[PDB]
Design a protein around this ligand. Structure first.
Ligand SMILES: *C/C=C(C)/C=C/C=C(C)/C=C/C1=C(C)CCCC1(C)C
Length: 208
């Protein structure tokens, strides 16, 4: 279990460093914003993972709290989504993470179920907007933006959907997956979402 944590920490740190240095050689005002958000996300995750090493799993949850909104923001900026749409997405993200926590704080099965159903419903709304709403918006934009968004979209929807699955079969849920393995799964997901997506985004001309 300690290894996945050390691994996660290292991968997040290197991802952050890489995005930071890569961004230095960029001056485009549009590109810089993406570098800002994209570098900040793994920076936040690194801090939390390193913290878990120093210790702890609520720390990882807290990083989800900070990073999910920024990831959504990254996508919103790519398709130049209007403020309202973005606020709604971020608000839904807060509900997702918020209810996930409240459901975790309740001991009675029925309340937990509803809180997490609400959390899942919030995630589904987010995935719907990205997949359907953002896709039409991207297809009316320059080819590079449309193509890069489609890839980020596909990756995002797959990775995000995996979290509740792992959560539901892990120690917070049915208790089928051992803490040891769950930590591994969430680390792979976190790195893929916060370093993998950034790589795809920042290596594209779509940010200019
Ligand atoms: C870097 C971290 C990322 C992209 C984290 C994403 C986390 C989620 C999409 C979590 C979703 C959950 C539910 C839909 C139900 C309740 C439990 C959660 C919080 C694991």
């Amino acid at each position: 279990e300690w290894i996945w944590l050390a691994l996660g920490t290292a991968l997040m740190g290197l991802g952050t460093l890489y995005f930071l240095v890569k961004g230095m050689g960029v001056s485009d005002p549009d590109a810089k914003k993406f570098y800002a958000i994209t570098t900040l996300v793994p920076a936040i995750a690194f801090t939390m993972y390193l913290s878990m090493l120093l210790g702890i799993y609520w720390a990882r949850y807290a990083s989800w709290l900070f990073t999910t909104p920024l990831l959504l923001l990254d996508l919103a900026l790519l398709v130049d989504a209007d403020q309202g749409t973005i606020l709604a997405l971020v608000g839904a993200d807060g509900i997702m993470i918020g209810t996930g926590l409240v459901g975790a704080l309740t001991k009675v099965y029925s309340y937990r179920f509803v809180w997490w159903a609400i959390s899942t419903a919030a995630m589904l709304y987010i995935l719907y907007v990205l997949f359907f709403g953002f896709t039409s918006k991207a297809e009316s934009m320059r080819p590079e933006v449309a193509s890069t968004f489609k890839v980020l979209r596909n990756v995002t929807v797959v990775l995000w959907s995996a979290y509740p699955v792992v959560w539901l079969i892990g120690s917070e849920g049915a208790g089928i997956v051992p803490l040891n393995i769950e930590t591994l799964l969430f680390m792979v997901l976190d790195v893929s979402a916060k370093v993998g997506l950034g790589l795809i985004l920042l290596r594209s001309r779509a940010i200019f």
